[PDB]
């Protein structure tokens, strides 16, 4: 199966590197065993995914690294043709913890570098082994760490060669401006990975990111409360184009310059999602899909809401 590499469909990042225009997500729900994460990642590489997105906090970096190593040994893919993203977690935002956390991720992934390393959120939490520290009342134990101070250490990780590109996740407009306007900035973020789909289409944040050559990367692209995939207008557009609702929802994002992370644990859905480059939506259908926006956030990260940098109070 032909690999969907940057050679096929890529987006140019503002540091010169290329990211494949469709990624494979690896968020693992509670109910899904880690053996299924490994199986799904192996199949994704087999059927042609080359952009693999993971995170320390998903707890499956080991399994993703095993899938990558087994695919390379089998001759499915070479390392230079893969684009691997992982993420720095809130409990390691203190500057002195950034590079050790990256090296820990690299060891778990069995990689010498990642293509993209991003701050998972703009909000830090208390350092320690627990990824979700709380007090007796269940409130999150937060920290005070300027994300610009954390950003400087991601810049150092890039200069050390441990990561090719650096970016952020779940930042809002004001927070991106803080990085872009920080004194002595070395590298702009190449991306802002956010929840984005037909019911939260991020038009305002996308406009801003485009104006700064920052790529918007979408998770929750199929809607993760209303069920996006059952939307009657979406399903009418799907029927008109002879494609599935999921493929319309992904194509909507692709045509707006967004890099979606598509994920399934079902092999047939993985392969279906790769067909997103085989059709395009008319301007009329894109306008119809624009009209579905609800500004509805399925993933509001409520565990961070007490912190002043909680990103989702502001309009964008």
Ligand X SMILES: Nc1ncnc2c1ncn2[C@@H]1O[C@@H]2COP(=O)(O)O[C@H]3[C@@H](O)[C@H](n4cnc5c(N)ncnc54)O[C@@H]3COP(=O)(O)O[C@H]2[C@H]1O
CA-derived radius of gyration, the chain: 19
In the bound complex, what is the minimum distance in angstroms from residue 160's beta carbon to ligand X? 27
Q: In sequence order, what are the residues at sequence separation of 6 or more whose Cβ sits closer than 8 angstroms to the Cβ of residue 223? A: 197, 198, 199, 229, 249, 298
Identified catalytic residue from 58, 121, 199, 252: 58
Query: From the CB of 184, what's the least distance to ligand X, in Å?
Result: 32
**Does position 193 bind ligand X by CB under 6 A?**
no
Interface of this chain with ligand X, residues 139 to 168, rule: CB under 6 A? none
State yes or no: 120 annotated in a binding site. Answer: yes
Exactly one of 263, 285, 292, 311 binds ligand X (CB under 6 A); that residue is 263
The residue among 167 and 220 lying less far from ligand X, judged by its C-beta, is: 220
Do strands 10-12 and 18-20 pair parallel, antiparallel, or not at all (unpaired)?
antiparallel
When binding is defined by CB under 6 A, the residue of 273, 303, 309, 310 that contacts ligand X is 273
For residue 91, state whether it binds ligand X (rule: CB under 6 A): no
Query: Per this entry, what is the length of the chain?
Result: 316
Cα–Cα distance measured from residue 44 to residue 268, given in angstroms and rounded to the nearest whole number: 10
Window 1-40: contact mask with ligand X (x via CB under 6 A):
------------------------x-x-x-----------
Nearest residue (CB) to ligand X, 133 versus 220: 220
311 binds ligand X per the rule CB under 6 A = no
Write the CB contacts of 253 (distance below 8 Å, at least 6 apart in sequence).
196, 197, 218, 221, 259, 260
CB 58, min distance to ligand X, A: 7
Residue choice 106, 190, 214, 246 for contact with ligand X (CB under 6 A): 246
- Figure out which of the listed residues 8, 15, 269, 316 binds ligand X, where binding follows CB under 6 A: 269
Does 272 bind ligand X (CB under 6 A)? Our answer is yes
Q: How far is the CB of 49 from ligand X (least distance, A)?
A: 12
Q: Provide the pairing of β-strand 51-53 with 10-12.
A: unpaired
Minimum CB–partner distance for residue 25 and ligand X (Å):
5
Mark whether 316 is an active-site residue: no
Nearer to ligand X, 58 or 147 (CB): 58
- Site residues for ligand X, 198-237, by CB under 6 A, read 219-224
| Interaction of residue 85 with ligand X, rule CB under 6 A | no
Binding residue numbers for substrate: 120
Catalytic positions, please?
58
Binding residues for ligand X (CB under 6 A): 25, 27, 29, 219-224, 244, 246, 263-265, 269, 272-273, 299
Binding residue numbers: 120
């Amino acid at each position: 199966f032909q690999g969907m590499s940057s050679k096929q469909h890529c987006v140019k990042l503002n540091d010169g590197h290329l990211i494949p225009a469709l990624g494979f997500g690896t968020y693992k729900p509670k109910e899904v065993p880690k053996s299924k994460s490994l199986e799904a990642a192996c199949l994704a590489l087999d059927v042609g995914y080359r952009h693999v997105d993971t995170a320390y906090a998903y707890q499956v970096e080991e399994e993703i690294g095993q899938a990558i190593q087994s695919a390379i040994a089998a001759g499915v893919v070479k390392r230079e043709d893969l684009f691997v993203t992982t993420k720095l977690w809130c409990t390691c935002f203190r500057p002195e913890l950034v590079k050790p956390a990256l090296e820990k991720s690299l060891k778990k992934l069995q990689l010498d570098y990642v293509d993209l390393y991003i701050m998972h959120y703009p909000v830090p939490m208390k350092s320690g082994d627990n990824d979700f520290p709380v007090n007796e009342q269940g409130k999150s134990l937060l920290d005070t760490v300027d994300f610009c101070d954390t950003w400087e250490r991601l810049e150092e990780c890039k200069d050390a060669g441990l990561v090719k590109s650096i970016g952020v996740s779940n930042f809002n407009h004001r927070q991106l401006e803080r990085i872009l306007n920080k004194p002595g900035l070395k590298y702009k973020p190449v991306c802002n990975q956010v929840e984005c789909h037909l019911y939260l289409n991020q038009r305002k944040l996308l406009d801003y990111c485009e104006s700064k050559d920052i790529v918007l990367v979408a998770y929750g692209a199929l809607g993760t409360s209303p069920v996006l995939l059952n939307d009657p207008v979406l399903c009418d557009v799907a029927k008109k184009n002879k494609r599935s609702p999921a493929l319309i929802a992904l194509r909507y994002l692709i045509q707006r310059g967004i890099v979606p992370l598509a994920q399934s644990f079902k092999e047939n859905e993985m392969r279906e999602n790769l067909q997103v480059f085989g059709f395009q939506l008319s301007p009329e259908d894109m306008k119809t899909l624009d009209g579905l926006n609800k500004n509805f956030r399925y993933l509001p990260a409520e565990f961070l809401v007490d912190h002043p940098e909680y990103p989702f109070v502001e309009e964008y």
